[PDB]
Amino acid sequence: GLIKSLAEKEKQLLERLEAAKKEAEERVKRAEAEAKALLEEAEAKAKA
Amino acid sequence: TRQKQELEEELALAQAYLEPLERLAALAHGLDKSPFLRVIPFLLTEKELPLVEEALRKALEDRYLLAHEAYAGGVPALVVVHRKEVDQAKAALSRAGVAE
């Protein structure tokens, strides 16, 4: 073979992990935001 | 006298092996720290290469890359194998009488 096939493929296999970490974090952050704001509404309401 | 001796020994190694390591490094560019792949360096002479190639191919199937570059004799050859097919490739070299 030729190492330029697998050399330039590795740097796509690397992107397939990377985009994975993104959409893991950026989803669990939204839920935490939805929980925070929900329990704030539960104060605003309780006190009212 | 220790410094001069150190330089001569040093120079001797550098002289023997600059071209083999240079050829082997290029062959396994990025492949020496990727967990993904494992590489095995080994020295081949021109006569030796067909036998080795056949021997790897029975051991390691078609899920392998064997590429070689020529130093000034034979070739230092590098085989790329998946991690855990490392043993299959080494057995093939050991059986041939090819050292690493």
Residue B78 has what DSSP assignment?
E
Among B92, B16, B33, B25, residue whose Cα is nearest residue B57: B92
Q: In this complex, do A10 and B29 lie within 8 Å of one another by their Cβ atoms?
A: no
> B65 and A1 in contact (C-beta within 8 Å)?
yes
Name the amino acid, one letter, at A23. E
Q: In this complex, do B30 and A2 lie within 8 Å of one another by their Cβ atoms?
A: no
Q: In this complex, do B34 and A10 lie within 8 Å of one another by their Cβ atoms?
A: yes
Q: What is the resolution of this structure in A?
A: 9.5
> After which residues, if any, is chain B broken (C to N > 2.5 Å)?
none
Method: cryo-EM
Interface of B with A in 36-75 (CB under 8 A): 36-37, 65-67
**Residue B42, burial from CB neighbour count under 10 angstroms (0-12, 13-18, 19+):** buried
Residue A27 has what DSSP assignment?
H
Residues making up chain B, counted from first to last: 100
Rounded to whole angstroms, the Cα distance separating B68 from B54 reads 15
CA atoms within 13 A on the CB side of A27: 6
DSSP characters over B24-75: HHHHTTTTTS-SSEEEEEEEE-TTTHHHHHHHHHHHHTTS-EEEE---SSSE
Q: Taking chain B, what is the end-to-end CA distance rounded to the nearest angstrom?
A: 34
